[PDB]
Design a protein. Structure first.
Length: 135
């Protein structure tokens, strides 16, 4: 896989952010993670949704460098969103959310699953520490 630079436009939710990628505005969905969301009526604001959303937002807004990393399979979903691992100063946002108990590892779709075991590892630790969603 390779990392490519991007620039923050707007964080929309815990797991969806708008970035400037190769000069174009694009919505990215973070690969392999489900955060509780603030967006959806059938739901409303679920618990830990505002927390997940502020975390992603702060981590990206305070970064020196943001990079996106596409996996081996398809790179957009049916809504036109890019499917990627997003890094803030070299730290994967998708993992950071899971490690903090602010996201679950999603239902995985091969072949987009390179960092799957890494993420499950972090999720088991957050579970062991009874953090946030696991509290």
């Amino acid at each position: 896989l390779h990392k490519e630079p991007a620039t923050l436009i707007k964080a929309i939710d815990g797991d969806t952010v708008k970035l400037m990628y190769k000069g174009q505005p694009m919505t990215f969905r973070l690969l392999l993670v489900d955060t509780p969301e603030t967006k959806h009526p059938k739901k409303g604001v679920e618990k830990y949704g505002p927390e997940a959303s502020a975390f992603t937002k702060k981590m990206l807004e305070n970064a020196k460098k943001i990079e996106v990393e596409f996996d081996k399979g398809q790179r957009t979903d049916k809504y036109g969103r890019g499917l990627a691992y997003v890094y803030a100063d070299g730290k994967m946002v998708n993992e950071a959310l899971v490690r903090q108990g602010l996201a679950k590892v999603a239902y995985v779709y091969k072949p987009n699953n390179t960092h799957e075991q890494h993420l499950r590892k972090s999720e088991a630790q957050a579970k062991k520490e009874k953090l946030n969603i696991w509290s």
